[PDB]
Design a protein around this ligand. Structure first.
Ligand SMILES: NC[C@H]1CC[C@H](C(=O)N[C@@H](Cc2ccccc2)c2cc(-c3ccc4c(N)[nH]nc4c3)ccn2)CC1
Length: 238
């Protein structure tokens, strides 16, 4: 996160750190708990990934330093990538991780609500992008979970900022015209959370952008509302 502040423990209980084991253990991506055996993340996160055996999901973490060899985690049973996915810039940048065990809900880990069909028309005024990603173009993964309040941008406005790209209604953008506050390297897969009528909704998944926090280059996110049916198709299969 560029231009953010340390989060308080338990502020974003849906937020997870998705670690890889190959070649060495390190944070790979963010993700959001959406069900007791489900993590919603970005599909691009799995570019390297040949098997889910190398993944580890950590829930209820504020600081990366809390993760050691004895720290409990959730294994990944299955990686479900949207079948129309080619690349982050083209869309369909959505993936589900089916966990090997059930997440026990508590004050340190619980699910975030998906947006509603009727809520495609609602105006979100209180949106936050969270993660352990970089604070500048070239740094390292942060220890403490960072947060930043970002305004949502229209598709027409986002499309003007991304000449040569096609910004679909399946993407949502967030950013300040002047920049200064944005998601950065290591924040992808994580949530774009918006509070509406005292309840938090998963509005977007951190996907791509031209650099970090640059003037007139908003962060591009998977528009979760456009994928509710696909999430239910995958999570509610008979
Ligand atoms: N302003 C908009 C914003 C949107 C989000 C975007 C983003 O986060 N993209 C991801 C895409 C990706 C590529 C490969 C695997 C997963 C995700 C990314 C992550 C990292 C990365 C990850 C872990 C690291 C580690 N452990 N040390 N260094 C690490 C660096 C480097 C480069 N790109 C940046 C721009």
């Amino acid at each position: 996160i560029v231009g953010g502040t340390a989060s308080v423990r338990g502020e974003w209980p849906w937020q997870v750190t998705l670690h890889t084991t190959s070649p060495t253990q390190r944070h790979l991506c963010g993700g959001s708990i959406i069900g007791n055996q489900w993590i919603l993340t970005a599909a691009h996160c799995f570019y390297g990934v040949e098997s889910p055996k190398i993944l580890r999901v950590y829930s209820g973490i504020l600081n990366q330093s809390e993760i050691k060899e004895d720290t409990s985690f959730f294994g990944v049973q299955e990686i479900i990538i949207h079948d129309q996915y080619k690349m982050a810039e083209s869309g369909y940048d959505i993936a589900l991780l089916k966990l090997e065990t059930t997440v026990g809900y508590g004050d340190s880990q619980r699910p975030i609500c998906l947006p509603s069909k009727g809520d495609r028309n609602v105006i979100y005024t209180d949106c936050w992008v969270t993660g352990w990603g970089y604070r500048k173009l070239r740094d390292k993964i942060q220890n403490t979970l960072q947060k930043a309040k970002i305004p949502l941008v229209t598709n027409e406005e986002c499309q003007k900022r991304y000449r040569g790209h096609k910004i679909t209604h399946k993407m949502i953008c967030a950013g300040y015209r002047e920049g200064g506050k944005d998601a950065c390297k290591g924040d992808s897969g994580g949530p774009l959370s918006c509070k509406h009528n005292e309840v938090w909704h998963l509005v977007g998944i951190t996907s791509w952008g031209e650099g970090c926090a640059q003037r007139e280059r908003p962060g591009v996110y998977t528009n979760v509302v456009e994928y509710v049916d696909w999430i239910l198709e995958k999570t509610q299969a008979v």
